[PDB]
Design a protein around this ligand. Structure first.
Ligand SMILES: *C(=O)[C@H](CCSC)NC=O
Ligand SMILES: [Mg+2]
Ligand SMILES: [Mg+2]
Ligand SMILES: [Mg+2]
Ligand SMILES: [Mg+2]
Ligand SMILES: [Mg+2]
Ligand SMILES: [Mg+2]
Ligand SMILES: [Mg+2]
Ligand SMILES: [Mg+2]
Ligand SMILES: [Mg+2]
Ligand SMILES: [Mg+2]
Ligand SMILES: [Mg+2]
Ligand SMILES: [Mg+2]
Ligand SMILES: [Mg+2]
Ligand SMILES: [Mg+2]
Ligand SMILES: [Mg+2]
Ligand SMILES: [Mg+2]
Ligand SMILES: [Mg+2]
Ligand SMILES: [Mg+2]
Ligand SMILES: [Mg+2]
Ligand SMILES: [Mg+2]
Ligand SMILES: [Mg+2]
Ligand SMILES: [Mg+2]
Ligand SMILES: [Mg+2]
Ligand SMILES: [Mg+2]
Ligand SMILES: [Mg+2]
Ligand SMILES: [Mg+2]
Ligand SMILES: [Mg+2]
Ligand SMILES: [Mg+2]
Ligand SMILES: [Mg+2]
Ligand SMILES: [Mg+2]
Ligand SMILES: [Mg+2]
Ligand SMILES: [Mg+2]
Ligand SMILES: [Mg+2]
Ligand SMILES: [Mg+2]
Ligand SMILES: [Mg+2]
Ligand SMILES: [Mg+2]
Ligand SMILES: [Mg+2]
Ligand SMILES: [Mg+2]
Ligand SMILES: [Mg+2]
Ligand SMILES: [Mg+2]
Ligand SMILES: [Mg+2]
Ligand SMILES: [Mg+2]
Ligand SMILES: [Mg+2]
Ligand SMILES: [Mg+2]
Ligand SMILES: [Mg+2]
Ligand SMILES: [Mg+2]
Ligand SMILES: [Mg+2]
Ligand SMILES: [Mg+2]
Ligand SMILES: [Mg+2]
Ligand SMILES: [Mg+2]
Ligand SMILES: [Mg+2]
Ligand SMILES: [Mg+2]
Ligand SMILES: [Mg+2]
Ligand SMILES: [Mg+2]
Ligand SMILES: [Mg+2]
Ligand SMILES: [Mg+2]
Ligand SMILES: [Mg+2]
Ligand SMILES: [Mg+2]
Ligand SMILES: [Mg+2]
Ligand SMILES: [Mg+2]
Ligand SMILES: [Mg+2]
Ligand SMILES: [Mg+2]
Ligand SMILES: [Mg+2]
Ligand SMILES: [Mg+2]
Ligand SMILES: [Mg+2]
Ligand SMILES: [Mg+2]
Ligand SMILES: [Mg+2]
Ligand SMILES: [Mg+2]
Ligand SMILES: [Mg+2]
Ligand SMILES: [Mg+2]
Ligand SMILES: [Mg+2]
Ligand SMILES: [Mg+2]
Ligand SMILES: [Mg+2]
Ligand SMILES: [Mg+2]
Ligand SMILES: [Mg+2]
Ligand SMILES: [Mg+2]
Ligand SMILES: [Mg+2]
Ligand SMILES: [Mg+2]
Ligand SMILES: [Mg+2]
Ligand SMILES: [Mg+2]
Ligand SMILES: [Mg+2]
Ligand SMILES: [Mg+2]
Ligand SMILES: [Mg+2]
Ligand SMILES: [Mg+2]
Ligand SMILES: [Mg+2]
Ligand SMILES: [Mg+2]
Ligand SMILES: [Mg+2]
Ligand SMILES: [Mg+2]
Ligand SMILES: [Mg+2]
Ligand SMILES: [Mg+2]
Ligand SMILES: [Mg+2]
Ligand SMILES: [Mg+2]
Ligand SMILES: [Mg+2]
Ligand SMILES: [Mg+2]
Ligand SMILES: [Mg+2]
Ligand SMILES: [Mg+2]
Ligand SMILES: [Mg+2]
Ligand SMILES: [Mg+2]
Ligand SMILES: [Mg+2]
Ligand SMILES: [Mg+2]
Ligand SMILES: [Mg+2]
Ligand SMILES: [Mg+2]
Ligand SMILES: [Mg+2]
Ligand SMILES: [Mg+2]
Ligand SMILES: [Mg+2]
Ligand SMILES: [Mg+2]
Ligand SMILES: [Mg+2]
Ligand SMILES: [Mg+2]
Ligand SMILES: [Mg+2]
Ligand SMILES: [Mg+2]
Ligand SMILES: [Mg+2]
Ligand SMILES: [Mg+2]
Ligand SMILES: [Mg+2]
Ligand SMILES: [Mg+2]
Ligand SMILES: [Mg+2]
Ligand SMILES: [Mg+2]
Ligand SMILES: [Mg+2]
Ligand SMILES: [Mg+2]
Ligand SMILES: [Mg+2]
Ligand SMILES: [Mg+2]
Ligand SMILES: [Mg+2]
Ligand SMILES: [Mg+2]
Ligand SMILES: [Mg+2]
Ligand SMILES: [Mg+2]
Ligand SMILES: [Mg+2]
Ligand SMILES: [Mg+2]
Ligand SMILES: [Mg+2]
Ligand SMILES: [Mg+2]
Ligand SMILES: [Mg+2]
Ligand SMILES: [Mg+2]
Ligand SMILES: [Mg+2]
Ligand SMILES: [Mg+2]
Ligand SMILES: [Mg+2]
Ligand SMILES: [Mg+2]
Ligand SMILES: [Mg+2]
Ligand SMILES: [Mg+2]
Ligand SMILES: [Mg+2]
Ligand SMILES: [Mg+2]
Ligand SMILES: [Mg+2]
Ligand SMILES: [Mg+2]
Ligand SMILES: [Mg+2]
Ligand SMILES: [Mg+2]
Ligand SMILES: [Mg+2]
Ligand SMILES: [Mg+2]
Ligand SMILES: [Mg+2]
Ligand SMILES: [Mg+2]
Ligand SMILES: [Mg+2]
Ligand SMILES: [Mg+2]
Ligand SMILES: [Mg+2]
Ligand SMILES: [Mg+2]
Ligand SMILES: [Mg+2]
Ligand SMILES: [Mg+2]
Ligand SMILES: [Mg+2]
Ligand SMILES: [Mg+2]
Ligand SMILES: [Mg+2]
Ligand SMILES: [Mg+2]
Ligand SMILES: [Mg+2]
Ligand SMILES: [Mg+2]
Ligand SMILES: [Mg+2]
Ligand SMILES: [Mg+2]
Ligand SMILES: [Mg+2]
Ligand SMILES: [Mg+2]
Ligand SMILES: [Mg+2]
Ligand SMILES: [Mg+2]
Ligand SMILES: [Mg+2]
Ligand SMILES: [Mg+2]
Ligand SMILES: [Mg+2]
Ligand SMILES: [Mg+2]
Ligand SMILES: [Mg+2]
Ligand SMILES: [Mg+2]
Ligand SMILES: [Mg+2]
Ligand SMILES: [Mg+2]
Ligand SMILES: [Mg+2]
Ligand SMILES: [Mg+2]
Ligand SMILES: [Mg+2]
Ligand SMILES: [Mg+2]
Ligand SMILES: [Mg+2]
Ligand SMILES: [Mg+2]
Ligand SMILES: [Mg+2]
Ligand SMILES: [Mg+2]
Ligand SMILES: [Mg+2]
Ligand SMILES: [Mg+2]
Ligand SMILES: [Mg+2]
Ligand SMILES: [Mg+2]
Ligand SMILES: [Mg+2]
Ligand SMILES: [Mg+2]
Ligand SMILES: [Mg+2]
Ligand SMILES: [Mg+2]
Ligand SMILES: [Mg+2]
Ligand SMILES: [Mg+2]
Ligand SMILES: [Mg+2]
Ligand SMILES: [Mg+2]
Ligand SMILES: [Mg+2]
Ligand SMILES: [Mg+2]
Ligand SMILES: [Mg+2]
Ligand SMILES: [Mg+2]
Ligand SMILES: [Mg+2]
Ligand SMILES: [Mg+2]
Ligand SMILES: [Mg+2]
Ligand SMILES: [Mg+2]
Ligand SMILES: [Mg+2]
Ligand SMILES: [Mg+2]
Ligand SMILES: [Mg+2]
Ligand SMILES: [Mg+2]
Ligand SMILES: [Mg+2]
Ligand SMILES: [Mg+2]
Ligand SMILES: [Mg+2]
Ligand SMILES: [Mg+2]
Ligand SMILES: [Mg+2]
Ligand SMILES: [Mg+2]
Ligand SMILES: [Mg+2]
Ligand SMILES: [Mg+2]
Ligand SMILES: [Mg+2]
Ligand SMILES: [Mg+2]
Ligand SMILES: [Mg+2]
Ligand SMILES: [Mg+2]
Ligand SMILES: [Mg+2]
Ligand SMILES: [Mg+2]
Ligand SMILES: [Mg+2]
Ligand SMILES: [Mg+2]
Ligand SMILES: [Mg+2]
Ligand SMILES: [Mg+2]
Ligand SMILES: [Mg+2]
Ligand SMILES: [Mg+2]
Ligand SMILES: [Mg+2]
Ligand SMILES: [Mg+2]
Ligand SMILES: [Mg+2]
Ligand SMILES: [Mg+2]
Ligand SMILES: [Mg+2]
Ligand SMILES: [Mg+2]
Ligand SMILES: [Mg+2]
Ligand SMILES: [Mg+2]
Ligand SMILES: [Mg+2]
Ligand SMILES: [Mg+2]
Ligand SMILES: [Mg+2]
Ligand SMILES: [Mg+2]
Ligand SMILES: [Mg+2]
Ligand SMILES: [Mg+2]
Ligand SMILES: [Mg+2]
Ligand SMILES: [Mg+2]
Ligand SMILES: [Mg+2]
Ligand SMILES: [Mg+2]
Ligand SMILES: [Mg+2]
Ligand SMILES: [Mg+2]
Ligand SMILES: [Mg+2]
Ligand SMILES: [Mg+2]
Ligand SMILES: [Mg+2]
Ligand SMILES: [Mg+2]
Ligand SMILES: [Mg+2]
Ligand SMILES: [Mg+2]
Ligand SMILES: [Mg+2]
Ligand SMILES: [Mg+2]
Ligand SMILES: [Mg+2]
Ligand SMILES: [Mg+2]
Ligand SMILES: [Mg+2]
Ligand SMILES: [Mg+2]
Ligand SMILES: [Mg+2]
Ligand SMILES: [Mg+2]
Ligand SMILES: [Mg+2]
Ligand SMILES: [Mg+2]
Ligand SMILES: [Mg+2]
Lengths: 275, 48
RNA sequence: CCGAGGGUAGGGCCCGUGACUGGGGCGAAGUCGUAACAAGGUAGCUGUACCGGAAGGUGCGGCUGGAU
RNA sequence: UGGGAGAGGGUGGUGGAAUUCCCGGAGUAGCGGUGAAAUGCGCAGAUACCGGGAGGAACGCCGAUGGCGAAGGCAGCCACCUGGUCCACCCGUGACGCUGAGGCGCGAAAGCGUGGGGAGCAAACCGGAUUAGAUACCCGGGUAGUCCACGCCCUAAACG
RNA sequence: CGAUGUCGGCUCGUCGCAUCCUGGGGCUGAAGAAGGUCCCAAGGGUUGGGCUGUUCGCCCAUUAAAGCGGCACGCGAGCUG
RNA sequence: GAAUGCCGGCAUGAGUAACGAUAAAGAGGGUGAGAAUCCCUCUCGCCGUAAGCCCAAGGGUUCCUACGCAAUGGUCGUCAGCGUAGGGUUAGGCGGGACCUAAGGUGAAGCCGAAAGGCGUAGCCGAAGGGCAGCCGGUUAAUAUUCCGGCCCUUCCCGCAGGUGCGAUGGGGGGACGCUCUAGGCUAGGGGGACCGGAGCCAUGGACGAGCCCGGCCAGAAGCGCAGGGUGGGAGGUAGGCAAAUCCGCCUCCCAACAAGCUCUGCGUGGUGGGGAAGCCCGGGUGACAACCCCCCGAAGCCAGGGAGCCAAGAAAAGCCUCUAAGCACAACCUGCGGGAACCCGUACCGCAAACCGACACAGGUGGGCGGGUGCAAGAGCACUCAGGCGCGCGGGAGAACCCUCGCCAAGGAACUCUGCAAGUUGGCCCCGUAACUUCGGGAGAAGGGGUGCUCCCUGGGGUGAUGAGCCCCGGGGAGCCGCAGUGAACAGGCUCUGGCGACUGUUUACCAAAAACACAGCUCUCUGCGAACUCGUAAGAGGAGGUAUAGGGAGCGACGCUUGCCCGGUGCCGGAAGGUCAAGGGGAGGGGUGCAAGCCCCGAACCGAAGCCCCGGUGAACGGCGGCCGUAACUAUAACGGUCCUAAGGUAGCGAAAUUCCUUGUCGGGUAAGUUCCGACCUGCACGAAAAGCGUAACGACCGGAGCGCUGUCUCGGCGAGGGACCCGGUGAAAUUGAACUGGCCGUGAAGAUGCGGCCUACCCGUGGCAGGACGAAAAGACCCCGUGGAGCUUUACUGCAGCC
RNA sequence: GAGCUAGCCCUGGCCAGGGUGAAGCUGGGGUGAGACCCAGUGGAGGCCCGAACCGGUGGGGGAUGCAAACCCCUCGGAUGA
């Protein structure tokens, strides 16, 4: 339920902010945070390898449990729901009856005080994690492992989900958030429900400084540069592309497919994405 | 206005100093050449 | 002190007028088509919407003030 | 107080028929379409047939000259929440009524905003016909939209 | 071309006369007044504005008249730009 | 003898420019061979959120003292940051190290690369971050939290006493955190005092006064007081914190809770130790048994790890505390006390500058802290002033032009000019009041106006205190006084109307462009299923991202509103298991060389044989493209209408002489006395047009047009005045340039613009202040232009390669 | 060679004073309940004015400079990209 502002500056006209309603606890678990080393988009050579990064707010990385089969059969209580700056989803603090504490991605509808559990027998309930093979067909699911024991890989951004479409041998058929149909192995774990904070996409940043807070530095168009910089550079006056639209490194950028041809996982993609 | 030379003792020793030169093939050739030329200083002076 | 009034500045309403522009009424015998009246030759009308030299056409839903 | 009939409204679920697309099988020389045709589709294997799958929308028979609502309007089936209404008994209140300028709310379709959805249909638009023309009627395509959620618009042959 | 700064303006003049005005004349299709045309004449004079970078030109209000050309399209070791 | 040759020497310009902020000087006395320039005194001026003081960096003896003045100092010099010599820097507590970790660097394990080398977990290094024990005064020519004095404190070793399951690089707690706003109580700092202490003072008309002037504190252990921070206690279970655990985490129960208690800081007090002014006399001495007290203001600092709100969600590690493990419980650890032990390096001086960076004693540049008082609404603004520091290392005259910076101006008031360029005007605060339009915020300080000092009288509310007085803060009313003028000085918007462009705040060509350019939220297309795509790298490895389609890359467009039409024949991209073409390779019909021969050797047709291309389709917010001629209406004109040629399709809405219109100052209308610009229209748009977006749009702009009001030295049209220069005298004393020169005008001539040639004219020799017409004056081997089988950046369906990808 | 400059990383520091007055909260009004209105409180913002600080808009001076980019007046930002 994104929050609007009254137009008392030019920027507040359009700025929207998340409502932070579900959030119940406003400082993180000290034993579960570590420093998140900012890169600026520089690699170990010191070279920029991802342009226009840097200068964002300081952040702490919250260690997330993307396995959950770590603690089969051990129930936990949902102790708190918290803001995580490192991802779009909110996070849930779990107090296991073990005493062990862990963060998971907070699915939609998860309530503080309820109990979650992981394992092949867990009830089909929002927040529980089971291997895919034991989840009934049609179940909306999130935080899906892509190979057994390798960690939750798919459907983690705010609002996303995968839907279980059918089974075939050792594999289940998922409709990913992109609409691709894919075979994922049945022993791969997944969590019942959709990721929460589904309004995240309707946030209007509102001003250029807001992008700067997130570490987004200004993006400069190819058509704004010179020929030494960019295929679109140069020209007297403004200029149209004057060639097929291209990246700074010269490859075409309107249509040109880029997935590797002979990639082994092609045997597991049923149908490519949609819309 | 601000000129180009803004002296800094730690910067000087860590950039042109004897130990920076020794750690690198080109820095050792600098030392080898300044010794062969007979320089009284192989490396810039800084107080430290 | 108040004070006719004069001056300065800014508002409100009305009237007249204006390059040009909008459609309206009217005018014995102009040009284009033929939308409506018969099932008017695609039943018509309709609110809306999009489109077309023009009447109009088509979509969606509605009315019989429609015929057989 | 005790009863009743009903597509009255809202929420959540859920069933089968059909269309379209996808995969597998089998099969070959046309299919489609019209007044007649052509565009279109088809040996790169279509149409017609069988099995599998996905998805949206609408609910056949019952169904009526029927029922419900103040109107707009409401039709598979199930559950919950909720309105109106009629009948019987003749128990309670004791004229507490009628209407109603303003006000407030509801208000088909189309249209608008922000998300989503998209099978079929289909403004615009393209093509094939017809024609003197044919910015039409007919034919093959096809985008909004038609569907959902919230928020707008407030119109009508909103008619008995 | 081992460099002669290039438009216009401003400032400062100076010269030519094929004379705009003023002075002197002949002819007139010169009644007067006012013109037209040509001859002599360079002493002095030849305004202030609107527009445009403008030169030029058109317009306003005047005037005896609001002349035309040269001086490296006079003048940037004088200014402007 | 020439190479704008090379090196050196020495000329010319020339006793010329200049002598480095216009804060400013005068005199007396001293010293000395010599004095505007050194020392001393008095007077004057300048800074005072500094031009004063303290740190850090950087510099490296410049510090202090004696003796010097050749050179250095823009003059002088007896002076000096200069020459010579001697002296000077004292730490367990300040800073760094024997402590921690941050980016990053390095790197046993390991990975990679022809070599050199590149990576890389832990570990190690790495600080202005964490952590950790000293305050006040005195002393030197020169150091001082360092020496000394007083009062405090830290760690290490050993010992005594008492207590305890002691013990760690291992587990846990803590350390430990943002931005804005902010409470209570304090301190720093400051204002006042009719109170306390003080050398004196009474002038010039008056005052011996509740007069003037000066000062009225600082540090302090335990204890106590005030104000705060931190913190639940008990028990049972326990499978989690990579062994163990009595610790920690989780569940339960009992008790305690806006507390209290324990604990830790800040402030006050505090044994005690210090300090102590004017004035006067010669840095000192006196004052002085100095006094050291009350009231007010009051932090941005302290209590602090305080409170609240918000989104963009805010280091690590050690110290420290707790738990246990081997081990050891004769040990070991905790608490108290005692004695001993306590190392290395820095410390002088400059430090907004004459000692640092700028070749200079250079008007530039340089991070942190303190930065007093009065008034002006506030304040670090402005004016003046304290403490303290300076008068800027050439002066003395004169009172021309001209230049700079500044002041004023009759009448006019933009007539100036490309342009109101520049300079006026306006200017703070309080009150009254305020338009179109709007996205309802704004536009707005709209505009426009009134008030503003001083005196007396009455009165309201708050803070401190006590509810009162005093001090202090915000006021309300009445009556008066003076001047030309009351934000009386200084600091402090001119305003409006209307267009173009860009939504907006931002960014940019360091050093000629700040803009309409870039960016920007936002819109769309496209790629990417995760060992993602993409990027850097030979690779390993990285970034992407410890992210996962509500995410990430690429591209265009550029808030928002209303919208974004037709063309897929060419190019691109996407789809298409057929067909055609197609390399190595497979195959081997059929040949050939050689040998006596077995054989050896070579060529080789059909046929099979990938991507790519061809071919079949799709696709525009992919590259792009969106017609011509002729005729036609009952006045004319013009064509709603028709004919025909061509195309892949013939530009729709909206806009239009435009930041686009050539003809052009198009035509008409507005504004003006007059308008090539401006605004509104028209449309035969040379040559607009829909995300290289189309048309609008409130607000915004040191952007660019046009107009009006206000006001002006911009101008008619100039005048006067000030100061710094220019000028003269003393001191010091450059420069580019320069073939040599005994270097005039005209009319000619001459390589076509002559001081230098011809003819004539004119002219005694040499300077000084001025002006710029010439010396085709100086400067820089023309940037334009061409030429060279010269160079370089850029492009592409030029050629040929290569990475990369298939 | 990144001691100048450009970007990023780690860790610190700085931004006088005044003005405007968002949401929220409270109360009052309102209604079937609401929306909503009013007042108070509150203190938001690439908000406003203006020093430090960061800039470099217009003009003038300078032009063998005080300076190989400076000086004067004026002007932009100043809680934020
Ligand atoms: C012509 O005007 C020329 C241009 C020099 S700068 C391009 N000027 C002198 O030649
Ligand atoms: Mg908003
Ligand atoms: Mg609003
Ligand atoms: Mg939330
Ligand atoms: Mg930690
Ligand atoms: Mg990293
Ligand atoms: Mg690295
Ligand atoms: Mg490196
Ligand atoms: Mg990149
Ligand atoms: Mg980057
Ligand atoms: Mg993310
Ligand atoms: Mg979150
Ligand atoms: Mg799998
Ligand atoms: Mg979004
Ligand atoms: Mg961020
Ligand atoms: Mg951009
Ligand atoms: Mg460009
Ligand atoms: Mg460019
Ligand atoms: Mg480059
Ligand atoms: Mg290139
Ligand atoms: Mg290129
Ligand atoms: Mg280009
Ligand atoms: Mg360009
Ligand atoms: Mg162009
Ligand atoms: Mg360009
Ligand atoms: Mg381009
Ligand atoms: Mg092009
Ligand atoms: Mg290209
Ligand atoms: Mg896909
Ligand atoms: Mg600089
Ligand atoms: Mg530096
Ligand atoms: Mg250093
Ligand atoms: Mg350093
Ligand atoms: Mg350094
Ligand atoms: Mg180095
Ligand atoms: Mg070194
Ligand atoms: Mg080597
Ligand atoms: Mg070498
Ligand atoms: Mg040397
Ligand atoms: Mg030696
Ligand atoms: Mg060296
Ligand atoms: Mg009809
Ligand atoms: Mg008809
Ligand atoms: Mg009909
Ligand atoms: Mg008909
Ligand atoms: Mg149609
Ligand atoms: Mg066929
Ligand atoms: Mg076949
Ligand atoms: Mg579907
Ligand atoms: Mg009864
Ligand atoms: Mg309706
Ligand atoms: Mg057709
Ligand atoms: Mg025909
Ligand atoms: Mg559709
Ligand atoms: Mg009816
Ligand atoms: Mg030349
Ligand atoms: Mg020369
Ligand atoms: Mg020249
Ligand atoms: Mg020259
Ligand atoms: Mg003039
Ligand atoms: Mg006559
Ligand atoms: Mg004359
Ligand atoms: Mg004359
Ligand atoms: Mg002119
Ligand atoms: Mg000319
Ligand atoms: Mg002209
Ligand atoms: Mg006359
Ligand atoms: Mg002339
Ligand atoms: Mg000429
Ligand atoms: Mg010419
Ligand atoms: Mg000229
Ligand atoms: Mg000239
Ligand atoms: Mg000049
Ligand atoms: Mg000129
Ligand atoms: Mg000259
Ligand atoms: Mg000259
Ligand atoms: Mg110019
Ligand atoms: Mg010779
Ligand atoms: Mg020379
Ligand atoms: Mg030479
Ligand atoms: Mg020579
Ligand atoms: Mg030489
Ligand atoms: Mg010599
Ligand atoms: Mg020489
Ligand atoms: Mg010499
Ligand atoms: Mg001389
Ligand atoms: Mg001279
Ligand atoms: Mg000079
Ligand atoms: Mg000088
Ligand atoms: Mg000065
Ligand atoms: Mg004197
Ligand atoms: Mg003197
Ligand atoms: Mg002297
Ligand atoms: Mg002397
Ligand atoms: Mg002296
Ligand atoms: Mg002061
Ligand atoms: Mg030095
Ligand atoms: Mg000397
Ligand atoms: Mg001397
Ligand atoms: Mg000597
Ligand atoms: Mg000297
Ligand atoms: Mg000097
Ligand atoms: Mg002497
Ligand atoms: Mg010393
Ligand atoms: Mg000590
Ligand atoms: Mg030791
Ligand atoms: Mg370490
Ligand atoms: Mg290191
Ligand atoms: Mg270290
Ligand atoms: Mg440190
Ligand atoms: Mg210390
Ligand atoms: Mg102490
Ligand atoms: Mg001594
Ligand atoms: Mg103990
Ligand atoms: Mg913490
Ligand atoms: Mg933390
Ligand atoms: Mg920290
Ligand atoms: Mg905040
Ligand atoms: Mg104190
Ligand atoms: Mg005070
Ligand atoms: Mg007396
Ligand atoms: Mg346990
Ligand atoms: Mg403390
Ligand atoms: Mg004393
Ligand atoms: Mg005494
Ligand atoms: Mg502060
Ligand atoms: Mg604190
Ligand atoms: Mg706090
Ligand atoms: Mg760390
Ligand atoms: Mg024992
Ligand atoms: Mg040692
Ligand atoms: Mg010292
Ligand atoms: Mg100092
Ligand atoms: Mg400075
Ligand atoms: Mg400083
Ligand atoms: Mg100083
Ligand atoms: Mg010096
Ligand atoms: Mg000094
Ligand atoms: Mg000096
Ligand atoms: Mg200096
Ligand atoms: Mg004081
Ligand atoms: Mg003030
Ligand atoms: Mg002076
Ligand atoms: Mg000075
Ligand atoms: Mg001086
Ligand atoms: Mg003088
Ligand atoms: Mg004189
Ligand atoms: Mg001055
Ligand atoms: Mg004056
Ligand atoms: Mg006067
Ligand atoms: Mg005047
Ligand atoms: Mg005027
Ligand atoms: Mg006037
Ligand atoms: Mg004017
Ligand atoms: Mg101009
Ligand atoms: Mg003023
Ligand atoms: Mg108005
Ligand atoms: Mg208004
Ligand atoms: Mg207006
Ligand atoms: Mg407007
Ligand atoms: Mg409004
Ligand atoms: Mg005003
Ligand atoms: Mg008054
Ligand atoms: Mg007075
Ligand atoms: Mg102002
Ligand atoms: Mg214009
Ligand atoms: Mg802008
Ligand atoms: Mg711009
Ligand atoms: Mg625009
Ligand atoms: Mg806009
Ligand atoms: Mg924009
Ligand atoms: Mg700003
Ligand atoms: Mg520039
Ligand atoms: Mg430049
Ligand atoms: Mg430069
Ligand atoms: Mg400039
Ligand atoms: Mg520019
Ligand atoms: Mg600007
Ligand atoms: Mg730019
Ligand atoms: Mg923008
Ligand atoms: Mg947009
Ligand atoms: Mg989108
Ligand atoms: Mg690469
Ligand atoms: Mg290699
Ligand atoms: Mg990573
Ligand atoms: Mg842009
Ligand atoms: Mg609008
Ligand atoms: Mg095409
Ligand atoms: Mg095509
Ligand atoms: Mg194509
Ligand atoms: Mg092939
Ligand atoms: Mg084309
Ligand atoms: Mg083209
Ligand atoms: Mg259209
Ligand atoms: Mg036009
Ligand atoms: Mg015109
Ligand atoms: Mg236009
Ligand atoms: Mg054009
Ligand atoms: Mg034109
Ligand atoms: Mg023109
Ligand atoms: Mg005209
Ligand atoms: Mg007119
Ligand atoms: Mg025309
Ligand atoms: Mg384009
Ligand atoms: Mg263009
Ligand atoms: Mg426009
Ligand atoms: Mg606008
Ligand atoms: Mg702007
Ligand atoms: Mg601007
Ligand atoms: Mg004007
Ligand atoms: Mg003047
Ligand atoms: Mg003077
Ligand atoms: Mg002399
Ligand atoms: Mg000298
Ligand atoms: Mg000679
Ligand atoms: Mg001679
Ligand atoms: Mg001579
Ligand atoms: Mg002569
Ligand atoms: Mg000639
Ligand atoms: Mg001659
Ligand atoms: Mg001569
Ligand atoms: Mg001769
Ligand atoms: Mg001769
Ligand atoms: Mg001669
Ligand atoms: Mg002669
Ligand atoms: Mg003569
Ligand atoms: Mg002289
Ligand atoms: Mg002279
Ligand atoms: Mg001359
Ligand atoms: Mg000259
Ligand atoms: Mg001169
Ligand atoms: Mg000359
Ligand atoms: Mg010459
Ligand atoms: Mg000349
Ligand atoms: Mg040369
Ligand atoms: Mg040349
Ligand atoms: Mg040259
Ligand atoms: Mg040149
Ligand atoms: Mg040429
Ligand atoms: Mg050639
Ligand atoms: Mg040649
Ligand atoms: Mg060449
Ligand atoms: Mg080349
Ligand atoms: Mg690629
Ligand atoms: Mg640097
Ligand atoms: Mg600030
Ligand atoms: Mg403040
Ligand atoms: Mg105000
Ligand atoms: Mg308020
Ligand atoms: Mg609140
Ligand atoms: Mg601001
Ligand atoms: Mg203001
Ligand atoms: Mg600057
Ligand atoms: Mg400047
Ligand atoms: Mg100015
Ligand atoms: Mg000059
Ligand atoms: Mg210069
Ligand atoms: Mg300056
Ligand atoms: Mg100034
Ligand atoms: Mg400001
Ligand atoms: Mg501020
Ligand atoms: Mg920031």
């Amino acid at each position: 339920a994104v929050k609007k502002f009254k137009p008392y500056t030019p920027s507040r006209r359009f700025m929207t902010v998340a409502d932070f309603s579900e959030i119940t606890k406003t400082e993180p678990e000290k034993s579960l945070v570590k420093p998140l080393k900012k890169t600026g988009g520089r690699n170990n050579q010191g070279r920029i390898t991802v342009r226009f990064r840097g200068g964002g707010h300081k952040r702490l990385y919250r260690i997330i449990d993307f396995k959950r089969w770590d603690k089969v059969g051990i129930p936990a209580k949902v102790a708190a729901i918290e803001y995580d700056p490192n991802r779009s989803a909110r996070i849930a603090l779990l107090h296991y009856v073990d005493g062990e504490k862990r963060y998971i991605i907070a699915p939609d509808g998860l309530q503080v005080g309820q109990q979650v559990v992981a394992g092949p027998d867990a009830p089909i309930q929002v927040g529980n994690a089971l291997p895919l093979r034991f989840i009934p067909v049609g179940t909306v699911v999130h935080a899906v492992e892509l190979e057994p024991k390798k960690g939750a890989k798919l459907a983690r951004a705010a609002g996303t989900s995968a839907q279980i479409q059918g089974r075939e041998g050792d594999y289940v058929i998922l409709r990913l958030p992109s609409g691709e149909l894919r075979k994922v192995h049945g022993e791969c774990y997944a969590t019942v429900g959709a990721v929460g904070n589904a309004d995240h996409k309707n946030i209007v940043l509102g001003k250029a400084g807001r992008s700067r807070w997130l570490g987004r530095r200004p993006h400069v168009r190819g058509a704004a540069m010179n020929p030494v910089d960019h295929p679109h550079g140069g020209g007297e006056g403004r200029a149209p592309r004057g060639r097929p639209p291209a990246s700074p490194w010269g490859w075409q950028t309107k249509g040109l497919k880029t997935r590797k041809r002979r990639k082994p996982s092609s045997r597991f993609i049923i149908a490519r994405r949609k819309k | 206005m601000k000129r180009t030379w803004q002296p800094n003792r730690r910067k000087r020793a860590k950039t042109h100093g004897f130990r920076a030169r020794m750690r690198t093939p080109g820095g050792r050739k600098v030392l080898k050449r300044r010794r062969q030329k007979g320089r009284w200083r192989l490396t810039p002076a800084v107080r430290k």
